[PDB]
Structure formats: structure tokens, C-alpha cells
């Protein structure tokens, strides 16, 4: 039933007695359900050290991964170029998923095409799909560039992108001068961040490899910036703002911040902003190239060093106080620009906030996950705040990256109780937050199911989620936030200490029980 | 818009395309004539998508894992292949269920074999057998496993049927191999058919020799309701108030046992014809169970459906039918009294999958709204035959619409509201056109039944009449 | 007892059995406490309509006010002037409280002096205290200006500030030319915002009354901006940023954003930034003066119109979409600067966020309180969001303000269930949130006690607090936020929709009970 | 440095002041000589503040309402006068209690008569009488009312004593008039004394001839512990483990009945001498109850205090004393073993109100720290007499320190930590000096007793050794 003045959606409609009785009858009559005592016994077992030991012995099964596949990263990279259409050679189901996954995180349109290879292409491959697909995409969507990646069926059949694109131009499907950079992006190698690196290196090769003779390092007096796979708008914006405040000439190579934030003014803009073709063509004339997320830009690094002859600096992601400091000092050295009064003062305002909030942060224990550069920067900042990052999970991490994070932990007393896990998933992390319970998780929306599981054990065992990472689907507009630079560190600090204080308020809200500590002032 | 203006709009839009694409897309766009009963005279459907044109379609794995198998709550569904497909489809579809997730139910979890290069080069069958043993250890209350194939499995020549048979015999377990690789077919649709045949071949016959079920004359199954936001529960309640006994729900909130009990029912009630007609025809063939199409969108359709279903039973069910209709009369009449004056005359364009593009028209008309364009991602001509009598004369029909077409049709027709999916939503809102998600219900619903109609009406009104829509034009422009 | 490797503070130390038993023995032995059944009975009665009617009949008793006293506002106004020391003539207890109150909100130093009048001054007045106080303050703290307000004992005794300051100069305690603007700020008239208006008009009079004959309206090509009592740093910053982006010349008159946000860099800065004496002397030469918070700047308005001959525009506070648009169109008219592409795009990004979030905001019911301009702007923006502002409380509101808010409510279908309350306090508001329960409160930290009370009746009755206003003492760094302009609207929208989704996640977290609606995607 | 360097630091700082201020301030600043037992030979105290110099002091209302009366949990305390004073003092002081707030306990609420101009002009006594009736209607479980006068009340000639007498008789209610207007005295100190006299005159004698209460030989009261962060509860537990019966706590978590029962105890245990010596001397005069000073900061002082208290009773209490000391020995020894190596040799400057500037020194010394400077807002010379023996030779003492002085002293002495209040905290943090609030405990505590020492040590370590302190200098500067 409904009352027209106060309509109930699924919650709380299905708590009405008639619905509850109906669902009891469904269960008892037809579901042959395990008895509640058996469900409770199994649940309790899944919280134990014995279960954790079996869980960590898995070799074949993955449960609740914390990574995605290469072409998702190729798409995001392509979206950062002016009037560029991401094009994925292969199976169309993939593109529906890529678009939807980004749609839900950015709450924006996400433009991407397929060339709709089907079973028939296994005999002969996808050459015709590339010909008609490039012609059709250019005519219909009027991009100035089509950036080509692959799905797994195209990789397994062995389609030669370079030959197929060259034949499309040879046979008149698209103009010879029309740019069609490409990258092979197999989903069974690496992760989405590997797709970003592959795509970027392909675009860089397209515009520079055959035009190197007239280049002179430093001649344009700029610094190239390569952001990597980045899903916070504020992270593109803070880097541009800091370099502009410092009077540093720069080119941000792959910059989707406009196309992921168009205004709602009565028109749809398929394309907006982005790195220009002239910027990519000119990039070898820069002083140097800085990689913001070096642990997924290794192929780009080899190209930039080997072909552009840039001496890419050994810099960590600019997260937290020390690594933002190091980024600005190295940019100052390269550019010759001093660090301005404005950024010195912003730094000091972050340090002020640290001094103001250190008593509530001290000793707090975190489980956290995400991509390798993000993770290592979050670990570093947590150590700077006097926090303990006790469960560090990077599903798509590697042994070299782990050694680097272990060295960061070893150098801080706040790292004594921390362990780094690579190749492990959110079902592994669920065990750790039961067996060695931290105060909070910092992670993406998939963490809400771990919080749900921990509450089921009891309120005292609940581990609240703090949403920082990708994807975030269950809150609105967090993609506008910043994690880089002093601004990012200020936002992170504020989110962490207020998550602590909101939980303490919950735990002290009980009238005549715990509200002796329900302080007005904290 | 006249028939002649709609025909002119189709030709104008098609001018952008190269000749091969233009000739193809012309066949997939039509101006409704409600007298036609052979839609194969006016529209082509269920063909390949043209490369490069930004189809909205998904793949067979979406149709099998995402749609049919994934909702079954007490089984573990393995996304078998590389990591993408299971991650993008993890908890994106709101196929609601009652259970203890990670313990007896598994719907919003992503189980995967996470193929690496070694698995592609040397095969995934050894990895699959080991994965099954790991599942049994760590998830002992699972009541069966399905293997949802992604693109590489058939391309590399793995034999998941052999692994399923050998492991199923070893563990005395239902293990269901599903060949729903995304390279098969043209859309989600073939995934439905593959999935239905896998239920037939590996699950449905288990109780064929068993006589222990206590049957009644009033036993039915709900076939093709995936319980989006609780849609199947707000349907079930009415069937059971009418005196029927709903043995099974395929597959929203569905259990493997209720699937296995379905051959024991008197009547299969088919909501989603596209996805479940296959197994409904099988059940009639093998078990003699009749099936019938019904529609629980809005009061007009819901009342017509309850009466048609009750007519299959005896006077006692026909009497209870009229008591259910009398109970809910004042509730839906109050919804119409409040919301119809807020929506009367407003025009809607829809674009959805295989059912909803025709099935929700009645509910819009119960609020005085007009559906002026509709179409489907992956419908076949039998769906279009059903659509042409539901749609008004001279309305626009589009099969496998391109992103370009949908934008240009909307620009000319200027609907008051658009109902489509997540890849469409944010485009149209920027254009100043109110948008409602008609897959996920925009995180609302249920929309089925009388209780769903109230929520549907609330939702169309909140969005169409929202104060945000007057604010897109800056006052200095 | 304590375990050294997990030390317990008050929470949860006092939940140990020995402490619980000790507290039970203290109660039973010595407190003569009302029986728990009687406490429960009286609690339940305080939630009823019968209790609410008696509560609303109060004439003499105030409980849990939502206002403070005039000199607090005078101090905040004074802080916004370059190298200016706020000075409160009267009793020193008042100054320790003003400084502490602001210390706790900004987490910054707050500099203010007293002249330490004692009971002895009741015979003879506080003239000597003014003489020695000005001399001592100038010598010790080297301000460039001392801005004088009063405490209530100085007002009751009747000290003539003008005469006392004049005599301090005449007798040589401070140089004639040293600026000592003043204002009478009686705590028994109006509220803290009245103190701000009085202090500001006194400073404006000091620098302009006697020098009008050389002024020409419009001759400096700038617009004066008067912010009023403002405790979000982001509000001073956003107004300056928007006028700068438009190329509009402006003078922000009272600008404490630097002194309330100094860096922690190893030195204490008593003064930083602020409105210059020259800006105030030159202010009559502006094109016009815009009042950002007109409902507490009425005395300022009379002086600016009467003496400077500025045609102050009839503008609401620039909060929400319509009133930010109106502000910018009026600034465009006055300055002759078009509204720039950057602000047009920011506006459309706000409208995008409204489109994206409208389904969760629609129909949501709020109780709210604060100062009059802040409250009316929050009400307006809530109506633009499709929300219902059902309990609108402004303790320091007046009848003319109420009539204005009532007219805004009457013009929207979202105002149908709303009531505006003036002169009522947070004990009145507590009754309303029991008798006519809203979804959330939007208020300051004193709202936490109402949330506590509602939870005690039961989880289903709990009304969560969303902290927007002043003071906010129990969360860190929220004073950095913004509520004005499109940026403030974006921040308020994001806070509201994520508060809604956080609560829905809490209500749907119950395993096999409500988690059917625990969606990954919202 | 030595007495030489500290005297010349004093003289250099005082160079900024005009002559009258310089001459006054010189008398309030001293270099400790621990052999002096007459501090009136080396420092002046409890005098007016010099105008314009940024005293840290509050007023008599703070000392009465804020400190003594406000914690009494089952009374309603009216801040009588205009709205400011009650609002700034609402829930600022962490005087913890157990109760049902708004129902039987009222501590964190702000009750006020919100004076307007008509109340100043024509008087507030009619408003006060009406306010009392409104309190009785809306807060029926209140056990008594106090009237905390703000500045205007005595200035306008209101008669709150007459209102309290007339309404108290009408309603059979304890209604306490308190003349704690902030124009009285020079600081919080006179508000203590005024408050003590109002307890004496209107509450403490109520049960003088009432012998209903069953006394034991082990009955004590905790006098002058306001239970900051639960400090009185972590003190009470030890006194009662030692076999004593704590009849009353003045006034942290205090009830009006426990105050009225206090004249039945055998011994008053005074923690805060400054605020409660007055009523302790009264109780010895009138009832013959002895009193003694004790100190529960840190293990050395808590052990000495327990033994000294137990010596006033019999062998059974002295035996239980040694059992308590044996029980907590391994706990406080573990705290020292962990924290003292982390803090040894670190130097602290303090500035607090009337007790803690001497009382916490032992607890610092238990962690190997040195208190190199201390001072008080509002102490009298009997406090300075007690301080000179607790502080080291040649340390700095400051009475009613100015903001300028404190900053200048800190810049020369360069302590490793400062312990002071909220108006001081953010200044010193910007200078890169670790700071702990020694009024509010920085929202931590308790600090009293064995359990409090653990938290004290944790807190001084977490702040002094925080990683933030190494980060104030930008590496390019
Ligand atoms: S049609 Fe899968 S998303 Fe793709 S590149 Fe392979 S891992 Fe990544 Fe359908 S079954 Fe899946 S979703 Fe595509 S791959 Fe095929
Ligand atoms: S010494 Fe009160 S804060 Fe003041 S101007 Fe009057 S309302 Fe406002 Fe002490 S008793 Fe109080 S706090 Fe001062 S006034 Fe006196
Ligand atoms: Ca958007
Ligand atoms: Ca600060
Ligand atoms: Mg905590
Ligand atoms: Mg405990
Ligand atoms: S899940
Ligand atoms: S409270």
C-alpha cells in the first residue's frame, strides 16, 4: 500500500508488515535457505584468523578486485586531447561498460566509440571494421583526432593496428593527414593504469618520433607535465594553478578537466578543452618532462628519455608536505623560477592545520587501497600526520613499488605496524580489517560492503569508510576534490580529522551513557 | 509533428553518414503506423551495429551474467576471463534480493578468474578447476556455481563444459558453463538466449523425477522480472493477494531451488518476453505449462493483467481479483489526482533495451503523458510488432539508435522528458531536458504494480517540474 | 586501570566495570536522584505538542540562545582593518570570552584588549582607564589603529567614548593624529551583528565625515564592498576572486581573511592584511557601496547614503543561483564590466550539479537557524534545490525581515510547509523537531545537543545536524569553507546531498534487513 | 641561563612599557628563590590588571558561574543579565557529569534572562520572578535554581536577594542569589569567594539539624575538583579502593544533595586550594571538620597524598592504602618506562589560573621534564608561597602575565613545550613550540590519579614529539 502524501520507495516500503510476511513466506516455501544459525556460524568463521589464512592461500580465485582493465585507462587518456574521440578496436560491450563506469564517477557524458567486431572477424580479423569505423566516426562525430586502443578479442585474434590504420588511409577511408595515434591495450596485462601509459606513449610517438631532427631541448622554455590516470578534477586544476602562480611555462599533456566538467547551459558539448596537437608536436622543445604518477608511466618515461632526450626527474607524486615541497623545488631548478610568496604561505597554512589537528590524528590506524602512486602518496601523508597506515593494499602493485613503500614505512616510527600487500583484493582486505581492526578505511565505494560486513559482527567492530579514490559512485561531486599539492593535503587532512570526530560524536551520543564525552568543543 | 515532418527529419539526420552507414541506418528508423502487424515491412532489427557510430548496446556477457544469471542470489557467478567485465558490471544493476552477502548470497560481489597472459597463451581450464575448489572452501554455503565466459574463453579454445562436468561430479554440485562471450551475437539479446538454454541444460531438469513438492491449483512463476528496486516484490504481493502462490521469480531475488521447482507450476507469467520467452516455450513443450505475457506498469495495465491472469483459474481467484482491484482503487486514484494535473500533455521520448520501450507507455498515459518517440537497443521484430499498436500514429521508432541520431531527433522533437540510460542522462540534462533513468529507475522504484505506480508518478513529476530547469539560461544571455 | 599499549581517555575509560559500579554507588548513596522511570516520563513529556505549547508561551526565560552580544561583532569588524587592535572599553571578563569564542571557531590567535574597568569606575567613570589603556596598548602592541567598542558596565555607567578619547589625545596619552574610531555597543540591544554594524559605521565616520568637501562619487572607479559579520574565510575570498575575474575595481571594507589564517612558519604575526586607512578615507570616491548582508547593516546604509551620497543597491546576500546572478548583474551595471566567460561557466557548472543531484534533494525537509542574511540566503537556495525549509529560526530576526522571508516562501511551492520564527531559541527549535520532524537540521555546533535529544527518543526520531553557520567548534577547519556565490552554492549542495546519502547508507547498512537498498551507485 | 640572565630578560621586556605600566609589571615578575617562604618579599599578586596590556584573566562571573556553580548538575543556573556571558561560557569548561540533560541535569545548557534595554532602564526583578515560574513549568525535575549576576545587575540596583527569598518561599525551592558581577574584584578569584559564601549562606546549612544520614568513620568529601575530563572520578576510585566513602564532590559531577550532606563528613580533602579554601575554613569553624591539601598529579604526588590521607584514619585504611599503591605500581611504572625516555630533559613553561601552575610540576618531573617558568592568572601570595618550594632555583615566575611578556619570555627561554589556555595555544604553535592546553586538557584526560597519569604522558609525548614540528621551515628558506 501507499499513502499519497508520503510515498515510500523500496526503503522503507518493504519493511511494511505485509511485505515482510510475504518475503518470509517466499523464503520458507521455495528458497530452501540455510538455517539462520548456520548463516551466523559461517559469518563468524569468515571473520577469523583461520579463515584469513585460507583466504591468503588463494592462487586462482579473485574476489572483489581493486583494479580495472587497460582500455579504460586508454579512454581516459584520449579524452585529455582537443577534439579527440577515444576509439576502441574490438568488441562493443567493452565501450558500453567503459562509458558507464566513468559516467557514474564524473556524473558527465563520456564519449567513446567501438568498431563492433563480431564472431565473423575471427576468420579474417577486424580490418574492415577499422576502415568503416574510422570513416563513420570522423563523418558523424567530427573529431580532429581519433585515438585507437583495443579490447581483448582484438588482442587474442592478433589484429595489427598499425597496418589496419595505414590501410584505412591507403584506401581513402580517412585523410592521410588525419591523426590516428594508437596503442595495443590487452586487458590480461597490467591494469587500467597500464592502458593510460600505453595510449599516452602512442600519442607522443605519433606527433614526435619522425620530426625529431628540428628539435632542441629547452628551446621553448616550458616544462611538460604528464598527469597519468587521474579522476579528480581538482588534481589537474591544482597543478596548472601552482605552475601559473610560479610563472612557469608548461604544457599539461592529456588534460580532460574541461570535457569532464561542461556547464549545463542548454547545449551538449561532445568536446571541450584538452591538450592541443601543437602542444604534443612542440613537446620535445621543452626543458624537461615531469611525470606526476611515475609508477604507471614507465613506458612513457622510456620514450621521453630515449627519443626527446629529456632527463626526467626522479620525483614522487606531489602528495603531502615533503613531496609537494620536492616537486616545487625541482620545478624551480628546471624553470629558473623562484617559489613565490603565495605558495610559501599556502604551505604554511597546511602546516598550521597539521598543528591544529594533530591530537585527534595521532596514532589513528587506517586500511587503504587504490592505484600505486595514489596509495604511496596517501601512506606518506598519513605518516606526516602521525597516523599509522597498517593495511596498505594495491591490487595492481608490483614488487619494485612494494620495496619503495616498505622503505618509506621503515624510515618513520609511524610505519612500525604497517604491511604492504600487492596482488591482493578487497576480500583479502575484509579479512585484515576483522583480524587486525583499524579505526577507518580510506578507499573507493566498493569499501562500503566491507563496512557493512564489519557492522554485522557488531557496532564495536565497525570500520567506517572514508571515500578517497576511484570509483566513487555513492556520493555526489567528490570528483571535484583535490588530493595533490598543499590544497590536496589540506582537503585530505580535513576529511580525515572530521571523519574521526563524526565517529566520536556517534559513540558519545548516548544519553546518560556515553554523552559525558559529547563535548561542544574539540 | 506530421508524418511528413518525421520522414523529413529522418532523411536530414542520415545526410551526415557515409553511404554504407546511411543505407543501413535508414532501415532501422520508421514512422509508426499502428495498423501494421508485420513490423518486417517497416523496420529491421537484431542486426550488427555499424562500426564507429556510438551504439548504446552492450554484449552477450551483459545479457547472460548482468541480466539473467547474476541476480540468482544463492549461486556464485564467475566472470571468467580478464578483470574488466566483472568489475564494470559489479553491482551496476539493481536486481534486489534478501540475503547475507558473502555468506549465503553473493549478488553484489565480483568473482573472477582475472586472466593474465599465461592463461591466454596456455588456457584457463586448470585455473578454473582450482578456482572452483577455492570457492568451495571460502564460500561453503553457495548452492551452485555458474561460469560466465568473457571474450577470450572461446577464442583460445578452452573447454569449460568439461571442467563443469568433472568438477560438478567430484563436488556433487551444480556447475553451469555459459558460453556468453561478448563476440557472440550483436547485443545483450543473444546472451539472454544462451543463458536460457544453460538453465534448461544444467539446472531446470534436476527435480524431473521428484514427487515431494506439495502443489496447489494456484501455483505460478513470475518469469522475466529482475526485481529492479524491488519491482518483483511489488508484483508478487498483488498475485498473492489475488490467491495465487508464487513458487518462483526468474531471476530477481531468485534462488536455485525456486528455479528447480518451476516445472511444478500451473502457469508461467511472462513480464520480460524478450529475455525469457525461450525458456517459457521450453517449459510448455516439455512440461505442458502454459505461459502468458502481462504488464504491471501503471494501473490500467496492472488491472487488465490481474483480470487476464485470474481468468486462467476458477471463480475464487476471479472474486479475489476484484477484491484486490477494489482495495487499490483509492490508492492509485489519489496518485492520478495529485500528479496527472502536473504532467498532462507532456511529451516523452524513450530509449531502453528489450521491453520497457513499449511496456511503460500505459503508465505514462495514466498520467496524461504522450510517448512521441521510442526505441530499443536489442529488440527483435516480434517486439516491434507489439510496439506499433502501443505507440500513437506518426510517432518515431528507432532501433539500435546512434548517439548522433538520438541527439538530433531530440533537438527537433523537443520532448518535455527523456527516459533512457546512464550513458544518455547527462547529455540531455545539459540540453535543459528533464531526464529519468528507465533502467536503474534513477536509484528509486519499484515502478511495477500499484505501489510502484505511486513512486513512478512522484519521480516523473519531481524531475519534469523541478526548479533547476528554469535556471540553465543565464539572465545576461 | 590502564593497559599501557592501549591507553583509554574518559571515553571509553569510564565504561570499565569498576568505574560503572563506582558511579552507581555515588548516585544511590549521595545524589538523591529522581527514579529513572520519572526521568523517562519527563523526557517523553518534553517531546510532546503539549510541552511545545507551554515552551512557546515563554516571556522571560531564554534557553540555549542562537545569538551573542554586540561587542563580539565589533571585535570581528575591527580585526578586518590593517594593523588594528580591537579595544573594548569596560570589563576584562568580556574580552577573555570574545577571544576564546573566536579562537575555538577559527583555531587561530585572536588579539583584543580591555582597559580593565573595575567597580571603582562606578563613582568617577572610566576616563583614566581610557587614557592609560590607549597609551599602553599603542606602546606595547604597536597597532596603527585602535578601534574602540564597549562592554555593558561601561554602557550602564554612561561613559562618553567620544569625550574620553578626545581627552586622551588632548592630555597627550596618544598623538592627535593616531586613529581611534569608536562605537557604543550595548549588549542589551540587538545582537553581535548589531555590534558589527555599529563598529563599521563608527570607523566609516572617523575617516570621512569631516573630509567630504573634496569627494566626488565615482572618481576612483571602484565599488565598495561591506561584508558584515562573516566567519567563513572562503566568503571574503570568493567575493574578491569574482570581482577580480570581472576586472571590477573594488575595496573590501573590513577584511580579516589574512589575520584569521596566518601561516605556521615559526613566527607569530599579530596583524596581517586588512582594509587600509586609505581605503576608508577614499571610500566616498567609489561609484557605489554594496552591502553583502543588508539586514544587519542598516546604520551603515544610512551613513553611506546620507553622507557619501551612494545609491546603495537593493541586493540580497549573494547566496544561491538567483541572488548570485543578481549580485553580478548589478556589479556589471555599476562598473560597466561585462560578466566574464569564467563566471558564466562556473554558474553553469553549479546548474549542472543541481541537475545531477536534484532527485535526492527533492522534498527533503530542513530545520535551520543563524543570522538573518545567512538564514534567508540558505532558505532561498533550499527552495532553488527543491527542498522544504520547514522550521526557519532566527533568534536575532525582526518583523520586517520575517515579512521578507515569508514573501520568498509564498512565491515557491517548496515554501508551503514552512514557518519563520523570530525571537525564539534552540529550546523552541528542539520542540519543533520533535512535533514536526524534519529530515535534517542545518545549524551551528549547539545543534548537536538537539540531535542527541532526538536520538534518545529513538533512532527513527533522530534528526542529524549538518554544520553550517557560527560557531562550529566540534569539527576542524570548516571555517575555510564558502557559502557565498556559485562556489558557496556548490559547496552547500555537495554537503547537503552527501549528508542525505550518508544517512541513507546508515539506514540501509543492516545485513539481511535493510541492505537490499545498500546500493553501490546513487 | 642563571638569575643574572633572567633578571636582565625581565628588564629588557619591560623597556616597551610606559612608566606607570613598567613600574607595576616589574612587581609581578620574579626569579625563584626556593628558600623564600614569604612571597610578599619577591612578588605582588591579586591586584588590578593594567589597562590595554592583554591580560589573560576573566571576571568574577567566570569564577562563580563558570567554575564553582555551573558544574552542579541537578540545579539550573541562570546567567542573569544580557545574552553574552552565558553564551560564551556555554559548555566551554569540561566539568563532566552523569545525567539526562534537559530533564534531570542541566550543565551544558544556557539559561539566561537575555536583558534588553527595558530591563536595564526599569530593572530585571519582575523578569526574574517570571523566569523562575517558567523554569519550574518546563524543567520540573530541577532541584534548585542559582542566579548568576552579570555586570548590569548591581549597577542598576536590582534586588535578586528579595526575589530569591520571595520565590523560594512561594515555591518551597532553594533559589540562590549570587552577586558575581564581573565589575567585582580583579579576576576569576573573587567570584570563587563570592560563590563559596553563597553556598554557605543559602545551601550548606539546610541539613544542620537533620541527622537522617548514616555516617561512617571513613566519610570524606573531595573539595575543589571540577572533574575536567573525568578527573574527579579517576580520583574518587582510588579514595574508595583505600576504604574511604566519598560523600561529596565539590563541584564536578556534583549534586545539590551531596553538597548538603558534606557537613556530615569526617575530613575535607582539598585539591583546589584557591577556589575552595574559603568554605573549607568555614566547615572547620562551624562543624569541626578538618581539611587538608592534597595533589593527585602524577604517581609521586598521588602516592604521597594517599599515604597522608590514610594517616588521618586507622590501620585498616593505611593497609588498604598500601594495597592500592601495590595494585597501580606496575601500571604507572609501565607508563614511565615507555614515555620518560621520550621526554627526559625537555623544558616546559606553564601559565594557568590558580592551582595547576604549581600542582602539575611533580607529574612533569615523573617524566623527567623540567618546569623552567610558571605563573598564574589570579593566584594570591599564599599560592606563590606554595609555588616557590615546587619550582627550581632561578626559574621564572609571572603573575597576571601580559600577552607581550609571555611571547617575549618564550622567544628567549625557547622551551620545548608550553602548557596554557586557548587564547595562548595558536600563538605558540605558529612559533613552532609544541603546546598542550592545561585547562581543557586539549579535549583529553582525565589527568588526575594513576589512570590520568597514563593519559597525561601519552598527551605530552604525542604533542612534543609530533612530526609536524620539523616541518615549519620551508626547505627553500
Ligand atoms: S564484449 Fe572485458 S571490458 Fe572488454 S577489454 Fe576484455 S576484460 Fe576489458 Fe563483453 S565479454 Fe567483456 S564486456 Fe567486452 S571483454 Fe567481451
Ligand atoms: S565582565 Fe557579558 S560578555 Fe560582557 S558585554 Fe556584557 S553581556 Fe557581553 Fe564577566 S559578567 Fe559578563 S563576562 Fe563581561 S558582561 Fe561582565
Ligand atoms: Ca554532471
Ligand atoms: Ca590555526
Ligand atoms: Mg577518537
Ligand atoms: Mg573498553
Ligand atoms: S558486496
Ligand atoms: S545541552
Author numbering:
A (entry chain B), C (entry chain D): 2 to 523
B (entry chain A), D (entry chain C): 4 to 480
Question: What do the authors say?
Answer:
Substrate reduction ultimately occurs at the multimetallic active site of the MoFe protein, called the FeMo‐cofactor, by a mechanism that remains enigmatic. The FeMo‐cofactor is comprised of iron and molybdenum atoms with an overall composition of [7Fe:9S:1C:1Mo]–R‐homocitrate.
Herein, we report a crystal structure with two CO ligands coordinated to the FeMo‐cofactor of the molybdenum nitrogenase at 1.33 Å resolution. In the Av1(CO)2 structure, one CO ligand is bridged between Fe2 and Fe6 in an analogous fashion to the previously reported Av1‐CO structure while a second CO ligand is terminally bound to Fe6. The terminal CO oxygen atom interacts with the side chain amide N of α‐Gln191 (ca. 3.2 Å), which may help stabilize substrate binding at Fe6. While the bridging CO ligand exhibits 100 % occupancy at both cofactors in the heterotetramer, the terminal CO moiety exhibits approximately 50 % occupancy, consistent with an expected weaker association of the second CO molecule under the experimental conditions. Av1(CO)2 was challenging to prepare due to the weaker binding of the second CO and required pressurization of Av1‐CO crystals to 80 psi to maximize occupancy of that site. It is important to note that Av1(CO)2 can only be observed when Av1‐CO is used as the starting material; that is, FeMo‐cofactor in the as‐isolated Av1 protein is incapable of binding CO on its own, consistent with previously reported studies. The Fe6‐interstital carbon distance increases by approximately 0.06 Å on the binding of the second CO ligand, which is likely an underestimate due to the fractional occupancy of the terminal CO ligand. Finally, and in line with our crystallographic data, the EPR spectrum of a crystal slurry consisting of Av1(CO)2 crystals confirms the presence of hi‐CO. The expansion of the Fe6 coordination environment to accommodate a second CO ligand represents a new mode of FeMo‐cofactor ligand binding that complements the displacement of belt sulfurs by ligands that has been previously reported for Mo and V N2ases.
